[PDB]
Design a binder for this molecule. Structure first.
Ligand SMILES: *[C@@H]1O[C@H](CO)[C@@H](O[C@@H]2O[C@H](CO)[C@@H](O)[C@H](O)[C@H]2NC(C)=O)[C@H](O)[C@H]1NC(C)=O
Ligand SMILES: CC(=O)N[C@@H]1[C@@H](O)[C@H](O)[C@@H](CO)O[C@H]1O
Ligand SMILES: *[C@@H]1O[C@H](CO)[C@@H](O)[C@H](O)[C@H]1NC(C)=O
Ligand SMILES: *[C@@H]1O[C@H](CO)[C@@H](O)[C@H](O)[C@H]1NC(C)=O
Ligand SMILES: *[C@@H]1O[C@H](CO)[C@@H](O)[C@H](O)[C@H]1NC(C)=O
Ligand SMILES: *[C@@H]1O[C@H](CO)[C@@H](O)[C@H](O)[C@H]1NC(C)=O
Ligand SMILES: *[C@@H]1O[C@H](CO)[C@@H](O)[C@H](O)[C@H]1NC(C)=O
Ligand SMILES: *[C@@H]1O[C@H](CO)[C@@H](O)[C@H](O)[C@H]1NC(C)=O
Ligand SMILES: *[C@@H]1O[C@H](CO)[C@@H](O)[C@H](O)[C@H]1NC(C)=O
Ligand SMILES: *[C@@H]1O[C@H](CO)[C@@H](O)[C@H](O)[C@H]1NC(C)=O
Ligand SMILES: *[C@@H]1O[C@H](CO)[C@@H](O)[C@H](O)[C@H]1NC(C)=O
Ligand SMILES: *[C@@H]1O[C@H](CO)[C@@H](O)[C@H](O)[C@H]1NC(C)=O
Lengths: 433, 118, 124, 106, 430, 115, 112, 421
């Protein structure tokens, strides 16, 4: 009956909000993310704070995606265009030394101009079968796969595009809330929430089917889905133990080049020496089976039906049917049908090599991966799986949107806006002089 | 100009502090000064009082301490009272304007009907 | 450090106002615009809060009282156990309703006070 | 600081030149308030003392006297309806220092 | 001593000023005009000086129109690799095969493989083609002499919508509400607004289409009516209906000009043959001119007035230019302006390469529009120049004139709320 | 009611005082400029000791050289637009005096003999 | 910026696209710096004043100087250097003192 | 006893780096305040005003050059012979080259002719008159459209709000250290962005005697800037009437090229008065000997490189001179003529990845300039040679007396009076 309105400023409250985060620390992200990180990052535990977090509705995922695409293109743009190489190619079977046929590669010749406008020369290069298509008649007249619809740009050899961890940081007036518990599993209230200024450092790793080089779950295997009982949703399985996968290219190249402008050399495969297999990956067998069995035990808590079946992917092109890796700048497309394919010392997956890539499943452009000299061996950590569901329970190592590869790292963070003003009742009325 | 006019006062035997006021069509609050004159029956007048647009008033010696040379910015009226014995004066109001280093009570109101009695 | 008292009741959280007041102000043609827009907006938000405190007559204060009574329909909770037994987040939700009304009342109250100070122009 | 009227009489029955004066105690100089009060026209001012001529007033007035203890009001012959008594009211301090009536006629 | 300085804030004064106004209200005119508009304060005893000429609002609108146009056109197919000498023969339509304005041109275009060169053909308007030299079958497109041109993307419409210009905070727009205001000088009925009424960015030359009407009589506005070298804007108080058309069905084809780029070109012409014409009522037009002349005689009394056709080089200054749908029309107005003081056909031509605003380097290629087109517009004003009997001719400006004629009543001012004046009060210190 | 009563007599008027990169740059310039104008008025009022007031009285006397018109010749006679023109050449002089007065007034309160 | 740096006694003197982006950044910084200083004075309870005092005793007395040794003797630049490494221990106290003061002013037992 | 007091208008500052703006591209419109009883420590080296001028002048140059004709279509084999243009005589250094270039129709080819300087082209192989432009190898040459008017217009640099520029008025300041008679300005004097490789042109002259400035004069790793108090008049000319031709490249795009040259056979050249040079150098040497006393001093030409470090780069507009200064720097302690080479394809700001083509100046040209200083390096006895950095030395000696500081208005002090409540 005698309370008065009091105005306060500096009130510790916030609202859900969407803003632009900045990226904090010739590598692509090292160059772009020029803002240094905090040498001693702070974290403030908010005692007695419950916050409703929501994966799949979290716009940071979308923001990370858009900045990655823009940066990717900013780095690729000031490089050599391959337009003059679209001319019809005269192709034969590339020679596999003593075996004599390199299944999967063609030896092509073409008439291309050089650094001078008035000079055209016949040049040779080796190409992968996956990127070469016939014009007609089953004649040896071939086109590069993307000269039919879009520009192809060769990546500059100086740019590795290697993922480095990057940190997303709030602008003044904003804060990032982080979810703890470690049983969060998707959406809803999270207790024991802490406040940070920047994320922990996420590498922008690009893969399909399996999730590589992410964080491991602290607790048991976590199966996350917007709606685990519905189909049409990506199921992200986050493992608490990694599976080591070793992938190699058991041969090496000799690189050659063609000037196709004032400098602007085009790099192309000259010769291939080594094993006939283009590539393969080593997955320990016992590790894989234990890991998959543990995943199933957790699936059974959502899926009471016995005999869960895992099958190979159903179809589409390599961006969805095979596992994608970027090792040293080389692009591997690995066949995972040797995995899954069961009901509930190593496994070798054959792998294909591709060079003209419409990365990000874009349709208006493609990048050409220059050849890498020397042999390639990479070891990665499988930290999770991407599954698609469906009479009985069936899952497949399907593909998904790129955003799904970042949700697995960003699920624990939320952005809120600070709102310093508010009111409350008080016992005392303003005194007026 | 402001058609200032008293609408007050009567004859009285006691000096008391009878109140009277003159209203006007002017932005009195906008630095006009108020003035009152002891518009006496014969012998012209004595000053009665003065006040600022902001009050901070001062009485003429005839009333001296026994005065209330009040005015209200909100009323746009020189509503005031004073003793100075049962003075035989009508009590006239005026407004004064300032000029650098000078002032004049150029605007005069119709006088009030004050008078002495008994 | 920042929001440390956010989950606490409005005792300590009614004191760390200097903590929250600060850091509302921070310490190539593509990203350059994104960053200028972000910086300009941080400034605009800061200023809108200051302009609002200005119109309510609370400029320069962290804690300010007024001449607007509490209605009790907004909230009929007692003073005891409102400040000491509730957090600001809970309170913000409890009285999300009538926010615009409160702000309108605060502006009206100050406008009337300004008119009274304007007419009573005390000077020498 | 009271104003002491001087030359406090200017009767006439015709337009005529006239003057009045005051030994004002106040050093108001020009601000002696020589407003006058002809007839009974609410004591409307004829002049802003010796500081300025009044609006809607005759140009006849011109004493040009602005000094402590030596103030004055004066005018050229104008209307017969010009009883410019010119009683002073020096700015002084507090309420103006009204001087004796100095009754006049024209 | 008794007069002291008072500082006031919120003082109702302003000064003339020039600032940046913002736009408020797929169609290109919606782009960057995402800001909604939804008020008017009449000033008491205010007379202010207005000037429709040297009005920065007009100049600013001109720049915005160009900038938006360029942004819209920029991310589209370049027609650079079409300067190849063309092999042009006669028209191919109906049974006569002689459309005077059309040619059937064959050309060498290289496909996306940059080796398999092939020939293609399309119909072109005569106005877009220049004879290289000598005899026939050696032609160039008119633009290859100056610049490469860009075709408009079919996905974007340039059809005008009303837009409003709005002042930023701290600024206001004063509006002149005098029904007979002539464009310059004092206006004694002024209101204050934040945004303009809604102006359509309509492009035209000799005649002003789809503007506001005068609320009073017909008003003749000019910077100096005495100087025949000034443009005279005639603002009508009644509209005149003008109905234009191309009564034939245009067939479209497409060419793969490059790897992901399609060039659009004209195929066959189906129907009756005439490129274009416009329907204007005779009685309406004659009444309209008589009324205009009667007002012109106020500036040129006891002298006769005659109207003659205009004279100049490019069609942009000799014809009535307008754009309906995606077709750019260049109509002959000699039937309107041939007099001394039931309808007129106004024969009209169509062109696909348009050097808008005489920017020279920039030009748009208008893709063909399939089927037939009809449009109805409102004539709201005329543009005249002058050169006994006085001669008036259709004029036209650089497009600033078409906006001066609508924004003539607006002025931008800066608000200056801080100021001082003397008072009786001294600051209280104690 | 912005500029309501503009053109009215100053006396009455005093009672109403209460009241993609191409576009990216234009929008940012407009926003930045609006902020600068806001802050400049606040700085000038604050530096003269008039923060928070619509009407502020100072210790600077009127010179009469700037303008020799009296009360009732300015107030209840002129409009604000006319007044602004009448003394516009003394604007900076007056502002400089207001700043000096405020400096002296605050310095007088930090005095080591009295406070 | 019409500096007249001298003796501390002078307290009476206290009153294309890429290019466009750089200029906007410069304008924004001028605003940000201005506002930071004003916010800080506001938090300390010195809003609107060129000169203010507080309830904080003159600590950092290690300097061993009196008013007559600093004022009317040493310049502002010299003074700033002598205590340049103590500013950060004054700031943080000034805010607390003001915040406690405002809380005391509205207390139920003393404001009531 | 005493209380804390806070001041907002405190006249103090700190070293700072900010963005400066220009005052007269630059369409920005343009009083010094002396600060008495203050000493400010200035350092012309590691002065970010120099670094900023460098970045901005490069950016501007590029923005002005960018919207013009690309010369890429001209990278064809050229059929080159010995050029004549007048009389029965070969002009040494000029080649008459013919080539096949695509017309604006993008189909037909046309044979064109142009004259090139020997320094503009390279041979494709030996024993064959087959040439290409020096920059068809890597990157591309952008033509400078002669609307650009690249001219040494003096530009004033101005600090933004919150900042001020301090200026040093010590006549013998000599690059570093404390400076008295320091004043505050908002804008610097105008500096003409004149670019050279030695023999600094059109700068300010020293108020006092010749000043020799070096970050470390007793070193070999540092460049020595000699600032003269008197300038040497230098006159440069190309006594030839050059006639331009025009080759259409594309859709309104055209290449401007030298067609024919008539006039003198003699090559472009520069000259200075001999007595002025000998006295000027002697005065420099006296000051140099103070730094290096009891040593024999010899002047030698630079050690070698691709013209920019061996010649005097001098620019009349579109005519870039590379003059041989061995006639100036050959000595031990009435007109001296220096032959000059002319080149049309340049590296601009010593940038290897870019090139610019300067169209020819029609008719004949004469340029007259002020030599205001020297850029020298060191090589028992002492040897001095022309040398220098990447144009930083052309801003130093003008910006050397200026420093940028941030104004810091807040501060605290003790007071006698406690806050009253
Ligand atoms: C001066 O301009 C105002 C508009 O700013 C005119 O006011 C309008 O008058 C019509 C009369 O039918 C009303 O229907 C409108 O509602 C009024 N508008 C507003 C905003 O009030 C006014 O009539 C004009 N006066 C003169 C002399 O032309
Ligand atoms: C030495 C000589 O021939 N001088 C000529 C001059 O006559 C001519 O006017 C100019 C071009 O305009 O070129 C040079
Ligand atoms: C490709 O063909 C050329 C033909 O001359 C031959 O020299 C080269 O060795 C071949 N390379 C491979 C891998 O077959
Ligand atoms: C990731 O791979 C590196 C390879 O050196 C290994 O050291 C690290 O332990 C792995 N992390 C996980 C989670 O397995
Ligand atoms: C791989 O490259 C090395 C040189 O770096 C070479 O000696 C080796 O023989 C190559 N590998 C094979 C399979 O030939
Ligand atoms: C959280 O709640 C507990 C309840 O006992 C309380 O003691 C603690 O102080 C609260 N935390 C904060 C930060 O106020
Ligand atoms: C008012 O309260 C109801 C619940 O009673 C809520 O749904 C609604 O959103 C509130 N309105 C506000 C905050 O305006
Ligand atoms: C403008 O044209 C439209 C066409 O539908 C018509 O409805 C409208 O009345 C016309 N306006 C004028 C002023 O004639
Ligand atoms: C020429 O002017 C006279 C002026 O009285 C007018 O009567 C006559 O009709 C005009 N001529 C024509 C053809 O209208
Ligand atoms: C008017 O339009 C009709 C068709 O609607 C057409 O037949 C007629 O010829 C046109 N008249 C003129 C003058 O163009
Ligand atoms: C500042 O205050 C602390 C309080 O503990 C004291 O220890 C310190 O000595 C003071 N600084 C001085 C006297 O310089
Ligand atoms: C120095 O330059 C001035 C013009 O700035 C010129 O008049 C003077 O003759 C020049 N002196 C020398 C030696 O070039």
């Amino acid at each position: 009956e005698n309370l008065w309105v009091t105005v306060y400023y500096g009130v510790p409250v916030w609202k859900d909000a969407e803003t632009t985060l900045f990226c904090a620390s010739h590598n692509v992200w090292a160059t772009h993310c020029c803002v240094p990180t905090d040498p001693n990052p702070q974290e403030i535990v908010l005692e007695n704070v419950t916050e409703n977090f929501n994966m799949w509705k979290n716009n940071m995922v979308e923001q990370m995606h858009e900045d990655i695409i823009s940066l990717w293109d900013q780095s690729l743009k000031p490089c050599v265009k391959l337009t003059p190489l679209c001319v019809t190619l005269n192709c034969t079977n590339a020679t596999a030394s003593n075996s004599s046929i390199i299944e999967g590669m063609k030896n092509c010749s073409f008439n291309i101009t050089t650094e001078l406008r008035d000079k055209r020369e016949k040049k040779n290069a080796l190409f992968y079968k996956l990127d070469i298509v016939q014009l007609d008649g089953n004649s040896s007249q071939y086109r590069l796969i993307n000269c039919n619809t879009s520009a192809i740009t060769q990546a500059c050899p100086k740019v590795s595009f290697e993922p480095i961890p990057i940190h997303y940081c709030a602008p003044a007036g904003f804060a990032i809330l982080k979810c703890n518990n470690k049983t969060f599993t998707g959406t809803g209230p999270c207790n024991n929430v802490s406040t940070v200024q920047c994320t922990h450092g996420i590498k922008p790793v690009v893969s399909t089917q399996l999730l590589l080089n992410g964080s491991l779950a602290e607790g048991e295997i976590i199966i996350r889905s917007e709606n685990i009982t519905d189909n049409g949703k990506t199921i992200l399985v986050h493992l608490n133990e990694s599976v080591k996968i070793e992938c190699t290219r058991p041969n090496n190249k000799t690189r050659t080049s063609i000037r196709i402008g004032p400098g602007q050399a085009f790099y192309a495969t000259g010769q291939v020496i080594g094993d006939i297999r283009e590539a393969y990956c080593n997955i320990s067998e016992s590790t894989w089976n234990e890991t998959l069995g543990k995943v199933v035990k957790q699936l059974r808590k959502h899926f009471p039906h016995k005999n869960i079946t895992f099958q190979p992917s159903s179809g589409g092109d390599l961006e969805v049917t095979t596992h994608s890796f970027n090792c040293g700048g080389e692009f591997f497309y690995c066949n995972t049908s040797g995995l899954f394919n069961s009901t509930w010392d190593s496994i070798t997956l054959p792998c294909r090599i591709k060079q003209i890539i419409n990365m990000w499943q874009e349709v208006g452009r493609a990048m050409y991966a220059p050849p890498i000299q020397g042999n390639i061996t990479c070891v990665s950590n499988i930290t999770g799986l991407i599954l698609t569901r469906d009479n009985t329970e069936t899952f497949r190592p399907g593909g998904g949107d790129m955003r799904d590869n970042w949700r697995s790292e960003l699920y624990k963070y939320k952005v809120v806006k600070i709102e310093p003003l508010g009111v409350a009742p008080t016992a005392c009325k303003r005194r007026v002089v | 100009x402001x058609x200032x006019x008293x609408x007050x006062x009567x004859x009285x035997x006691x000096x008391x502090x009878x109140x009277x006021x003159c209203x006007x069509x002017x932005x009195x609050x906008x630095x006009x000064x108020x003035x009152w004159x002891x518009x006496x029956x014969x012998x012209x007048x004595x000053x009665x009082x003065x006040x600022x647009x902001x009050x901070x008033x001062x009485x003429x010696x005839x009333x001296x301490x026994x005065x209330x040379x009040x005015x209200x910015x909100x009323x746009x009226x020189x509503x005031x009272x004073x003793x100075x014995x049962x003075x035989x004066x009508x009590x006239x109001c005026x407004x004064x304007x300032x000029x650098x280093x000078x002032x004049x009570x150029x605007x005069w109101x119709x006088x009030x009907x004050x008078x002495x009695x008994x | 450090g920042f929001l440390g008292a956010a989950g606490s009741t409005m005792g300590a959280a009614s004191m760390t106002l200097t903590v929250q007041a600060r850091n509302l102000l921070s310490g190539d043609t593509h990203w350059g615009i994104k960053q200028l827009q972000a910086r300009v907006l941080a400034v605009e938000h800061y200023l809108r809060d200051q302009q609002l405190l200005g119109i309510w007559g609370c400029s320069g204060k962290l804690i300010c009282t007024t001449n607007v009574p509490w209605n009790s329909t907004w909230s009929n909770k007692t003073l005891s156990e409102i400040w000491d037994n509730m957090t600001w987040l809970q309170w913000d939700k409890e009285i999300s309703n009538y926010t615009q009304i409160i702000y309108g009342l605060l502006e009206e109250s100050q406008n009337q006070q300004e008119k009274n100070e304007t007419d009573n122009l005390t000077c020498d």
